[PDB]
Write an enzyme that holds these catalytic residues in place. Structure first.
Site, PDB file in Angstrom:
ATOM      1  N   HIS A 151      -6.702  -1.283  11.199  1.00 31.65           N
ATOM      2  CA  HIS A 151      -6.143  -1.896  10.298  1.00 31.65           C
ATOM      3  C   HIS A 151      -6.844  -3.322   9.503  1.00 31.65           C
ATOM      4  O   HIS A 151      -6.952  -4.199  10.630  1.00 31.65           O
ATOM      5  CB  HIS A 151      -4.472  -2.287  10.332  1.00 31.65           C
TER       6      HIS A 151
ATOM      7  N   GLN B 136       0.668  -1.204   0.309  1.00 31.26           N
ATOM      8  CA  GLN B 136      -0.249  -0.036  -0.128  1.00 31.26           C
ATOM      9  C   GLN B 136       1.010   1.453   0.118  1.00 31.26           C
ATOM     10  O   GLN B 136       0.422   2.824  -0.391  1.00 31.26           O
ATOM     11  CB  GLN B 136      -0.938  -0.160   1.301  1.00 31.26           C
TER      12      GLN B 136
ATOM     13  N   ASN C 297      -1.059  -9.444   4.854  1.00 33.38           N
ATOM     14  CA  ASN C 297      -0.908  -7.906   5.031  1.00 33.38           C
ATOM     15  C   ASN C 297      -0.442  -7.517   3.617  1.00 33.38           C
ATOM     16  O   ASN C 297      -0.517  -8.069   2.964  1.00 33.38           O
ATOM     17  CB  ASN C 297       0.130  -7.692   6.080  1.00 33.38           C
TER      18      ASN C 297
ATOM     19  N   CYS D 217      -5.297   0.969   3.226  1.00 29.16           N
ATOM     20  CA  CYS D 217      -5.429  -0.978   3.499  1.00 29.16           C
ATOM     21  C   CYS D 217      -6.987  -1.628   3.271  1.00 29.16           C
ATOM     22  O   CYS D 217      -6.553  -3.066   2.433  1.00 29.16           O
ATOM     23  CB  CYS D 217      -4.908  -1.088   5.321  1.00 29.16           C
TER      24      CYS D 217
END
Length: 316
Positions: free
Chosen positions: A259, A115, A283, A121
């Site tokens: 997140h 990102q 992630n 995110c």
């Protein structure tokens, strides 16, 4: 002047180079001090690990010269709200889930993305869930555009690099009737004007489904659906510099998440003693973070870091 550690000199120099840092003004001095403080903290954690006090280790990475507060402001953009309810998740009748599941080996997941310095995110979590559902439906895996979501989902409630919700991104795809491919609308890591072109759309959705706030329900959902979008409390320095092992942080919150990420499976680890269960999480901080971009988060430990609090997926 300040007490910089002379034995860290070479490492600092190489670190700046490997990450292409350009400071000047006066910034190099205080950035080095932040980096040295983070380095000592990483060393203390790993020493405590050797002493049997942690289930995971830490390591220096591209976030070395940032304070946790700076990182949280720039990176963690999940809004932590539920404006509208989605479809109810109906668990299968008389069903028991497998002991472990990994959707990566079944072809449902694209390579790890990054990102950059943007609070997008929420967009990455959304495209990851949509990519899995399009694969379930068609047998074809194609990387989707986060930039398309960043630039065009303003009307739904998203705020580009300042944050948003996965549910709002799912709503946009339905309202808009499509989403372009990563290839045709690449990531720039900054909000720009909407450039959506229906000619290059490769995905679609008709709403979203919500998973109840229960880890047992989330396990059954992952086992019968595929990857699921979730949100966690990722504001601790232990998470920013996570390297490998099962992540467990005593100060994590199950109420305050910031997140958005993607659950791609779950499993366990055992010895004559104990360690136990985990959620396999993808992630969006690049491959250099964690285990090739992934993290094993503590499972069935009282909803650790709020992993089961904001879970949902798109209907295709």
């Amino acid at each position: 002047s300040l007490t910089f550690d002379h034995s860290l000199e070479a490492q600092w120099t190489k670190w700046k180079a490997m990450h292409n840092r350009l400071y000047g003004m006066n910034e190099e001095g205080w950035r080095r001090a932040v980096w040295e403080k983070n380095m000592k903290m990483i060393e203390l954690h790993n020493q405590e690990y050797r002493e049997g006090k942690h289930s995971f280790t830490m390591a220096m990475n591209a976030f070395g010269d940032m304070t946790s507060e700076e990182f949280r402001q720039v990176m963690n953009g999940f809004q932590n709200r539920k404006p509208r309810k989605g479809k109810v998740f109906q668990e299968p009748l008389f069903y028991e889930a497998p002991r472990s599941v990994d959707w990566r080996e079944k072809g449902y997941v694209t390579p790890v993305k990054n990102q950059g310095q943007c609070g997008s995110c929420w967009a990455f979590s959304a495209t990851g869930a949509l990519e899995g559902q399009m694969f379930r439906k068609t047998g074809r895996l194609i990387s989707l555009s986060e930039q398309n979501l960043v630039d065009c989902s303003g009307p739904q409630g998203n705020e580009g690099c300042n944050g948003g919700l996965m549910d709002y991104a799912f709503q946009y795809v339905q309202d808009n009737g499509g989403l372009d491919s990563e290839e045709s609308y690449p990531y720039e890591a900054t909000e720009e004007s909407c450039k959506y072109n229906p000619k290059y759309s490769v995905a679609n959705d008709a709403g979203f489904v919500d998973i109840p706030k229960q880890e047992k329900a989330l396990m059954k959902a992952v086992a019968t659906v595929g990857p699921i979008s979730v949100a966690i409390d990722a504001g601790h320095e232990s998470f920013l510099f996570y390297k490998e092992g099962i992540y467990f942080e005593p100060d994590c919150s199950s109420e305050d998440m910031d997140h958005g990420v993607l659950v791609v499976g779950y499993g366990f680890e055992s010895t004559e003693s104990d360690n136990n269960k985990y959620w396999l999480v993808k992630n969006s901080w690049g491959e250099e973070w964690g285990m090739g971009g992934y993290v094993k988060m503590a499972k069935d430990r009282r909803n650790h870091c709020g992993i089961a609090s904001a879970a949902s997926y798109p209907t295709v």
